[PDB]
Amino acid sequence: TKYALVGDVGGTNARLALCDIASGEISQAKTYSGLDYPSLEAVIRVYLEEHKVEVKDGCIAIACPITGDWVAMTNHTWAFSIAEMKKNLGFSHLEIINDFTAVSMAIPMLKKEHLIQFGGAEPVEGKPIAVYGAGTGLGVAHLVHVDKRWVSLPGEGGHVDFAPNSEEEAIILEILRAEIGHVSAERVLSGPGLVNLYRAIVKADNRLPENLKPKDITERALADSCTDCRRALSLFCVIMGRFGGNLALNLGTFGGVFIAGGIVPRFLEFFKASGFRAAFEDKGRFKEYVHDIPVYLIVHDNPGLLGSGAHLRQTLGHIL
Amino acid sequence: TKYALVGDVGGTNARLALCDIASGEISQAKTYSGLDYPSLEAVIRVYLEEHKVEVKDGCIAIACPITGDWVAMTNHTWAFSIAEMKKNLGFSHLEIINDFTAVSMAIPMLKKEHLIQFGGAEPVEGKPIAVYGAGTGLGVAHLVHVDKRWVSLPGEGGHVDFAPNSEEEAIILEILRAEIGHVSAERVLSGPGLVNLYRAIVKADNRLPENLKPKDITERALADSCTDCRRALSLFCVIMGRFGGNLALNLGTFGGVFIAGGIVPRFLEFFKASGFRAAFEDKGRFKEYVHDIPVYLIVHDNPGLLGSGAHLRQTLGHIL
């Protein structure tokens, strides 16, 4: 058959599309609100009837941990067993992968207009790749090319210990360690991480924080209306660089460091002028090591759908 | 041919031996001093004539980064070209790998008597593996099993930003940051790292350090004759755990975390009584994640010779 089902479920939104098995091309993308449907398979059934095409294979990416037949969404009230949905749909293959796996698998399919470069030279072919994004949480994955095939290396890299460098970063660690216990990088590189950076900075002045959400941190920083909001956003960009620099040092990722969407596009212009690349290269003797490594921001509209098709096609035996 | 030459060359000494291409067994190992011979070629020639063996393939592990055809070592008189040496020796395959790459490739060859487990459950076959060792510097490598083949991922992971967790670790960062600026993990997890920890502890207590070498720190700590040295060795063991746990989270190293010799065997009993494993699992919500990941200390005599044979045999088509 010519088409397989591809998906990208991210909380309240379920995006489904058709993927050409021969080419990996995505088409007929439809987005359904998860609040209007009781199950993911209910959406898939509605989508399959509308396009009147027969599919036997499928690969859906979900923004939740996937290990075990029972997939449970972070807050959304969708939970299912992969085998039950496999039997109910009559599917030959039903791949259910983490959303960050799919995003990493889309990188071999991306062209340069889907990327924005932040410093560095050209990538080195055949070298490892680091992918990380700061959204609701801190997703981290790695990409390695072995024998014409792309293997995805998953993990929970977002929960490694936060590593402060400057003075200002050290006071933040001290404040957070007093409230929470171990302080992971996710506590400062994420949606809630922006608030944590804000709340820590306000308490650094021996004051009490004001209650506002990450969306209020961003536009107040961009409007120059709250001095603390711009301070936290600038520190968030610096910490994003330091984190990305550690990733490149650890795995020698001369294929590139990729930022996967998240909250960064909400302040793209502010991010462009920050000390992100400076903190990325602030590695002591090994600035020259990561100096030439390029950092790209993925601006492709649907990397989850693209990478789900790439992973499924490789599963079925195609070479990307 | 039955035998291939394998080698493990450092700053001053070159160890060469024979590898049974069928079994991977290392035999007839001899160490030569690089001050008595003008080139690495000369040492290989005298070995092959004083052992009367006749090899066609060889693989040598060198304690310096391998970037290109020219190998620039610490023994500058021995700097050579890979292609030139291959033509001079008449070899059909001459693989030149980093010393820490060879140690990581010894993992598939190691028996139970060469490993001491430090916590964790059984390893999961086919899952990634993290290797690190604290010697003169901090070497970090990763192993991935793809299509019946073991691939080594090199990097400079020992130079990522040091991540303090406890309040005592935070003050160490402040002390060192005022001296050298960027504080990588190598500045605490190494032979010189012991001295740095010792100086930072006494400086935190408003006292003046002595001019001690790493061997002094371990000696006083094991003899309980210096509380400063004892605290330094205790903190080293704890930071050793935290660093390894960060590696495990980042790449999901369910195939195990391996400590490659270094200075740890010199205080093995002190290491066993330390809070190493507890610091390894001090990962907040993800203590349960790294709880099942096993940690092994490698106590093999010559892992570089063992791993060099493994890499060469894999390159020659054999499956480990």
Residue numbers in the entry:
A (entry chain B), B (entry chain A): 2 to 321
What did the publication describing this PDB structure actually write?
Glucokinase (GLK) catalyzes the first reaction in the glycolytic pathway and is a target for regulation in a wide range of organisms. Group II GLKs are ATP-dependent enzymes that lack the classical repressor open reading frame kinase (ROK) sequence motif and contain more than 50 partial and complete protein sequences, including Escherichia coli GLK. This work presents the structure of apo ecGLK bound with phosphate and the structure of ecGLK in complex with both glucose and phosphate, implying a role for phosphate in regulation of the GLK activity. In the ternary complex, phosphate is bound adjacent to glucose, and the B factors for the α4, α5 and α9 helices were further reduced, while r.m.s.d. spikes were observed at the end of the β10 sheet and within the α6 helix of the β-domain.
Here, we report the crystal structure of Escherichia coli glucokinase (GLK), which has phosphate bound in the cleft between the α and β domains adjacent to the active site. The phosphate-binding site is found on the edge of the small and large domain cleft outside the α4–α10 cluster. Arg286 is also important for stabilization through phosphate interaction and undergoes significant structural changes upon binding. The guanidinium group of Arg286 moves closer to the phosphate, allowing the formation of several stabilizing hydrogen bonds.
